[PDB]
Design a binder for these strands. Structure first.
Ligand SMILES: Nc1ncnc2c1ncn2[C@@H]1O[C@H](COP(=O)(O)OP(=O)(O)OP(=O)(O)O)[C@@H](O)[C@H]1O
Ligand SMILES: Nc1ncnc2c1ncn2[C@@H]1O[C@H](COP(=O)(O)OP(=O)(O)OP(=O)(O)O)[C@@H](O)[C@H]1O
Ligand SMILES: Nc1ncnc2c1ncn2[C@@H]1O[C@H](COP(=O)(O)OP(=O)(O)OP(=O)(O)O)[C@@H](O)[C@H]1O
Ligand SMILES: Nc1ncnc2c1ncn2[C@@H]1O[C@H](COP(=O)(O)OP(=O)(O)OP(=O)(O)O)[C@@H](O)[C@H]1O
Ligand SMILES: Nc1ncnc2c1ncn2[C@@H]1O[C@H](COP(=O)(O)OP(=O)(O)OP(=O)(O)O)[C@@H](O)[C@H]1O
Lengths: 362, 362, 362, 362, 362
DNA sequence: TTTTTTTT
């Protein structure tokens, strides 16, 4: 008897697991009889219940091995390797088409037979989101395409407006949608430059809590951030490759992704002010609060943060042909499901009632 | 014959140990004949006497082996792996339910037949805490709910007041109850980077003693804390994942825990102010001051500053329906024990005594 | 049977792959039968489909190995060794031939078997270059000469002027044609090392804007950039070898390479400019915006940024006799393939579109 | 045959050896034929001469081992592991009892058959110390009880006075008695981060000659100390765990020890002074000076610094009930030896000699 | 056949080598034919020619090994381990006794028939040194015992006098005789910590050329060092341990060693004058200058700097009883040699020449 | 290999 490292690796690939402890912990669960595995019986997690019986025999033999972390290290490296092969070979539009398939597979579960969530609330989110700004689903489709075509030095959108104006609210959902990362500008230039090292393979990025100096005219308590933007204006423009930090591995050089950054109106150089392809003002909108104070399940469940909310909004608005091609198979089968659950009058009722500043329902 | 590595791992699972030297040291103790083991006979540490007989046979072989630290390292990473799996897959509520079972177990010891402390002194403790604030037990129910829901931008509580107001005490009790960590931010901006790394995978965190600036006009010597947290809104808001590191380790990326901030009274900007949900004023009460000086076992056993006392307070005051369904059986047991162990009127009198600043007991 | 480590090492030098993760990922693909490999059938990536059938047998056995990552580390060390050998042995001419020898291959990709592009656009890009003066084609060749004919102080070109002077686009383009790296300055002197240590064992180095003082009459921010330059004699005029410290790290010593410094208009402590090949002063021109306004594709495809344009600038303007002996024949072939598209009247037609910034497809 | 790793571990255990090189060097001393060992015959060093004969056979085989440092590292791990296990599971009273056992063992060796130190000279130092403060022995027992109980916030004593006051003399004695480390707080505010790292697992700490502020009238050098202490009030309070750091070590977390602060007569802010239980002001004493000047053997053998001197004072002054039962057996035997050796007339005469400032002896 | 790791280690012991690379290089040379060895035949280095004969047999096999560097590591560990055992167990008298044995080994070679240097010239050194200060030979013996007895407070010596007054010449010879280190304390206080770090496990220290305030009154360039020393009482007094730091390493705890201080006539605080045992005035003496002009071979061979020069002086001037009993056998032989080598009258003529300012030899 | 250091 000896461990099949191949079967271990196949789980890691099918899981797309890329943490060595996470995989180690995960695989050890399979050593017991799936026949009475309460997790399986509960259909507790798909990462478990889909795989327990398949891997049982190997996991029992793995459970006794003396090499366990070394086994897992090779498996995790194949996953990172696959990511990087894709990362350089694939088209940006092609990448997106794979990301969507990931999210659809989750919705299969979320609203499955184990329909643990329920779509009523999520469409109310779509309504509330589609209340926030004009042509909402368009400007999504617009920024979506912008990030695919990646026109050099047309690469970033920006937002401004008071605290709680919702700009973070928009931003977070866009990031959950695409995948990507968010980072902090304002830390000192050493820590800064290491932090940039997270950008590897990220299709898209954001920065939060960014500061300029001197916003105190707007009463804004102020700080460094703008300085460290200006340091990276080639990253911004993506004009070039640039190097990216690591620990215990070489720093690696490549071109830098596009995206969005959080601001409110501190000072900022005009080489930035004139630079960017887009910006939007977030203005607070009281009737949202007066729905929200009722509809608080939205926040508890992070529905308004969900990228799945955005996808549902696009599935709601746009015609099937407007999406990338192969997904249109599944788009229709979701378009179907929307028709089945929702008449227009459902969403009509929802958004109207909401728009009056009432709680979500009557 | 050979050492079973599996048996060592199982002991680490059973103890939930995760320091290689603690594991190594403790496992070596088993090598003597458990038959005669003085520590067993004294019944001194359950981490030992519940396991010595079981592990004896394998501890003798471990005492010979040339690999000892390697065997221990595997087991510790197994426990850490388990933590990461749990962290990624339990509901916030289940984590707390697990944590509460651990405290109930320690209480079954502390007031078990071994009775290493007096349940009456511990209940005397609870009275002093209940006295400390308006609607104390309702206040605690609020805080647990807040930490469990973890609602975006509604994650932080601010204790403020004068010196010796008890705010640190209350934080330390809440901290132990949920099992957070404590963090300093009156620190240099560079090594600050490694400080926050502690907070990886914690349920809760607390920021101590956040020193303001211009404070010495008010006799409070100015310091970095406020000048520092004002650059960390991303972390507090918990709205998007943020990245964390440790020495010789690459960055994790996760949401930041909810938590508490403590200060003596300092000026706070609208920005940071907007990101706390509740703030609480504490003020000295000379009758409490006197009573501790009589009842000083409250300090010496640190009774007034343990989650055990808060857990007890919740048990006495809250309906069993307010507990998660899984644990409710043990709650009924302990409620019945306590309602049997103490009348209302003893508790009534304790409050009168403590309100009257005399030593607690008569 | 066993993995041939030799075969893996061949593929690294054939593909010139020099990342262990990429190498591992690429190579793992070959374990499926090339016979039916859809990537091969679709002929998407030569780095795949050229090699699959050869490596398939070895790849299957590799995919089974326990030791896979170390096989790849040795293979990547092989390529790193070759590069280090060449970087020491050859002359700047030979090295520059080896570039042009396969910027040639870029032509064979840019106009590769797909009908990869229409060279019209590329010379429209080249034509957009030559616009500060009709001298500029010489200045390319003259700069290239200064690089091979490197003499002390005959090292650094002061590329002087405000935004949108194109200087950075050009610097980036040369950093593709020749290679080299780009760098910053306005630092404390230790951090300036931790910056400049990037330059280890390289042949061409480029730099960005530097703070003088007192220039706020042209709104130029004062600072300590110029202050560091007065200290950098041992590098700037550079007659004698000097060390190349990265922070705490790789303290190489040699002659520091030549290249280009980019900065705005600023005052002149002549102590500095004395060390330079140049003081060449640039400004934007209004009509050039109105060209770009109407020639947008030449930015969109990065044609204007690519060093490829500089090859074809040189292929146009410089007579074949000026090129290195073995490429001259290929220069004829791209003077042929120039004339396979271009009369000088079309070149002039495009110049005279630009003469008032007419859309250059005219 | 083969090296017993177990025997090496036992030697490390019995010598309580912390250090891998010290262990290596020691063990190699045994490789030479036991019966001729001059170190044994000269009875030079019990750490050698007790063990040589037993370990001899394995030491010779160890001398051949190709693996020597690995064996020592494993052995040192078990000694380190023991300390960490004890640190968690011991009562603070038990720790102190163990520390006393070790000092009492050193006192056997000093005054035993080896005749190596003069019990009469040592007793003179107790007389000089019992003069140094009012009620001197009472202060020691209170300090011991203070440090055993470790009451939150009520954890630190402040020593104040001029130069040549004796305060660091007394602090050093209490530190050797208990075990612990001094610390210097006058450092730059970065290196505090590593300076405090020394506190890990200690039983006491001493902050040495904290520099305050102003006070050129006071004729005191200024420094960081006082204000920088206030920035660490948490570590005084000890109410909650803190995070501590050593070079190359990832952080470990503990309650910061109780201890002593020493300073000249600077001003102190009560934000800090609220955290001192008790304050002792020393005075210069002419008769002590003139006594010491004629009692130089006290200093020439460091008697009045040494922890053994304080232990001898407690044995003389304190009833046997004040000691923990385990050592009451040994305490009684030492009391017998002292009352055999001395008389109260003698001790009073010594104290009178100190009071008269003559040499202690007459 | 196998390599003897033992034979390598024995060589490392006897060379007292502690650099892994240096040990490696030396041993590899023995692989060449010992019987023909040119380095042996020319008697170039004793560390080679004494050993090549024995180790050649093993060196041949060493040259084939693949473990070469790890063999050297274990060898060098053995030397370092020996030094640790020594430092923690020898008496300071035994420590000195070893270093004299080492110096006498060197002298045995220098004044040999093939290893050769001029026993006549080196005695001109002692004549010159014995003129630099009255009762020179006794002063050395006094200083020596002072360093050995290391009595608290009685620990430190002050050298005072103008530039070019010989104080550092004499200090250097003492430091060579005793194996200490120099330290410079004119730094600003915060930087001193790594300076003081140098002292770890050293026998002596010399504080070089301390600058005071107010020197400009006498054109002495002024500086901090005086005030820094006044701030270091505990290091000087040497009564109690202090903690010392080296780069990357964690702290060491030890008595700060005894030593020497040198200065021009800066005004010395009364506080410092209490610290020093001994003040020596160094003054320019015009006759020594003219003697040096006429006998520069003293400078050219560095004779007057050498601890070997001082050791010769002690051997000439001090009774055999002054030396430690164990070394006296070598001393008597060296006395016998010098008794043969010089009449007293020839030596006395040299003194008369030195007093005459004439060249030492005639 | 980082970390510590460096410098702050
Ligand atoms: N348009 C809006 N009007 C009123 N409240 C809003 C609006 N958008 C968001 N909110 C409230 O603000 C909270 C925080 O939203 P968000 O973080 O996106 O705002 P923000 O403008 O980006 O804030 P900040 O600049 O402080 O980070 C939301 O959870 C919601 O309760
Ligand atoms: N209401 C009160 N009146 C007087 N003393 C109090 C009161 N509550 C607590 N104390 C005392 O305050 C001491 C310290 O409490 P705690 O550390 O929690 O206060 P704090 O305000 O957080 O202090 P700090 O500002 O020092 O951090 C307690 O040990 C208790 O003796
Ligand atoms: N002479 C010019 N007139 C107008 N626009 C120009 C000119 N040269 C370049 N541009 C355009 O200006 C934009 C920026 O070009 P580029 O970065 O090369 O200029 P730069 O002078 O080096 O700028 P910076 O100093 O801001 O880095 C590009 O879109 C480019 O096409
Ligand atoms: N009370 C005293 N009266 C007179 N001389 C004293 C007294 N205490 C100590 N001495 C003398 O002073 C020397 C140094 O004592 P010590 O180091 O404790 O002084 P200190 O001024 O209190 O020190 P620190 O400022 O470092 O705490 C002693 O060795 C002794 O010679
Ligand atoms: N006592 C002396 N009389 C005359 N010349 C002297 C005397 N001592 C030293 N010399 C001359 O001074 C030179 C330097 O001597 P040395 O370095 O010991 O002087 P120093 O005063 O201790 O110097 P520094 O203060 O610079 O360290 C010697 O090489 C010699 O030429």
């Amino acid at each position: 008897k000896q461990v099949s490292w191949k079967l271990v690796t196949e789980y890691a690939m099918e899981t797309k697991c890329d943490d060595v402890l996470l995989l180690l912990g995960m695989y050890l669960e399979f050593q017991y009889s799936f026949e009475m595995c309460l997790k399986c019986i509960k259909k507790e997690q798909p990462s478990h219940y889909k795989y327990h019986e398949k891997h049982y025999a190997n996991a029992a033999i793995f459970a006794d091995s003396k090499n366990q972390k070394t086994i897992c290290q090779q498996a995790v490296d194949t996953v990172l390797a696959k990511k990087r092969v894709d990362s350089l070979q694939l088209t940006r539009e092609q990448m997106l088409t794979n990301r969507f398939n990931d999210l659809l597979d989750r919705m299969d579960i979320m609203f499955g037979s184990t329909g643990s969530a329920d779509i009523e609330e999520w469409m109310a989110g779509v309504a509330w989101l589609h209340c926030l700004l004009p042509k909402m689903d368009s400007v999504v489709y617009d920024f979506l395409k912008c990030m695919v075509y990646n026109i050099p030095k047309k690469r970033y959108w920006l937002f401004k407006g008071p605290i709680d104006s919702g700009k973070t609210t928009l931003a977070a959902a866009l990031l959950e949608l695409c995948g990507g990362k968010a980072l902090n500008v304002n830390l000192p230039l050493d820590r800064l430059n290491f932090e940039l090292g997270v950008a590897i393979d990220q299709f898209l990025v954001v920065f939060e809590d960014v500061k300029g100096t001197g916003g105190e005219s707007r009463d804004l308590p102020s700080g460094q951030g703008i300085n460290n933007l200006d340091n990276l204006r080639d990253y911004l423009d993506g004009s070039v490759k640039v190097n990216l930090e690591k620990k215990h591995l070489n720093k690696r050089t490549q071109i830098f992704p596009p995206g969005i950054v959080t601001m409110n109106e501190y000072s900022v150089p005009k080489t930035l002010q004139a630079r960017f392809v887009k910006q939007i003002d977030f203005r607070p909108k009281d009737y949202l609060k007066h729905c929200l104070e009722r509809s608080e399940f939205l926040l508890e469940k992070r529905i308004i943060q969900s990228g799945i909310a955005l996808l549902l909004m696009l599935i709601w608005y746009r015609p099937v042909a407007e999406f990338a091609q192969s997904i249109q198979s599944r788009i229709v089968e979701w378009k179907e499901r929307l028709d089945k659950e929702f008449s227009l009058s459902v969403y009509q009722k929802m958004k109207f009632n909401v728009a009056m500043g009432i709680g979500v329902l009557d």
